[PDB]
């Protein structure tokens, strides 16, 4: 699994 964010 992957969260991310900018």
């Given at each position: 699994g992957y969260?991310?964010?900018?």
């Open positions: 969260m991310l964010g900018s």
